[PDB]
Amino acid sequence: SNIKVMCRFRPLNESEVNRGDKYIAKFQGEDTVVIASKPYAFDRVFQSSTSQEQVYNDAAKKIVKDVLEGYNGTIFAYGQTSSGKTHTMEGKLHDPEGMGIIPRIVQDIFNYIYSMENLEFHIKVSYFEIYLDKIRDLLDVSKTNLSVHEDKNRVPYVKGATERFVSSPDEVMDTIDEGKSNRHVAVTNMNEHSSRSHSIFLINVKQENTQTEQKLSGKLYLVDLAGSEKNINKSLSALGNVISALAEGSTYVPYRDSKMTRILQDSLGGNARTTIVICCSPSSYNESETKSTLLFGQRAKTI
Ligand SMILES: [Sr+2]
């Protein structure tokens, strides 16, 4: 921590306008939003017309550089259903202007790599979903209840999760498209299922300098969380407890409160780099969920 929080408001959608909703967010400077006369400050606040490129530049581009220096990292999208999480994390996957964080990260990683001579790179990706605290491999639909374990050096791993070596951004994008298709298997209503489950995309960048033999490894987890809007989702409550513990400098961090936070243990907090993008509707209709989303983001404020 090493945890940054950035708030992204989207425009009102046509359904909110058809209902007669009002735009209730006000902005001060670049880092504060006011709701019902209360200010909420973050590392950055994105207004409703912020482009995909600006969001990537502020939220993710530095973390990509760090992963290529051998750090681990995580980027989360958090917020109520329809607040813009998937538009932020994925966008229009193949459109140069509309693409989201994930395809831009893939582009930058490979462009950086192409720009290196004595360095040798190995890139691996995995893609899974957490639904009801159960891990399902999006690259192998026969693997639906995977367990979390620790290795001998104590690094977490998902036992038996598919790993795919990739050598081009199009290979990565093809892998994401395959996972999105496989996600439909044994699922009645995809849209509802997606809003109630977490998708986790892992990119593992390993490198060795062949003339000095130094090796570096970095893992970047990209997480599109379930809707935060009767219980709080178990992964989300675990995530809040972990962020709050890190924010107060606690020696003990309760990663074991969920499978998701156990998986991310070496890529969330400590020496790892993290950005949480909280996504919000500006609608008067969603005011109390927006308040709750902003309060979740303030968990990261260091005390
Ligand atoms: Sr869950």
Author numbering: 7 to 122, 124 to 236, 252 to 325
What does the publication say?
Kinesins are a family of microtubule-based motors that play important roles in intracellular transport and cell division. Kinesin-1 transports cargo within cells, a process tightly coupled with ATP hydrolysis. Whereas kinesin-1 in solution is mostly loaded with ADP, ADP release is accelerated several thousand-fold upon microtubule binding. Here we characterized kinesin-1 P-loop mutations that interfere with ADP binding and determined the structure of the corresponding mutated nucleotide-free kinesins.
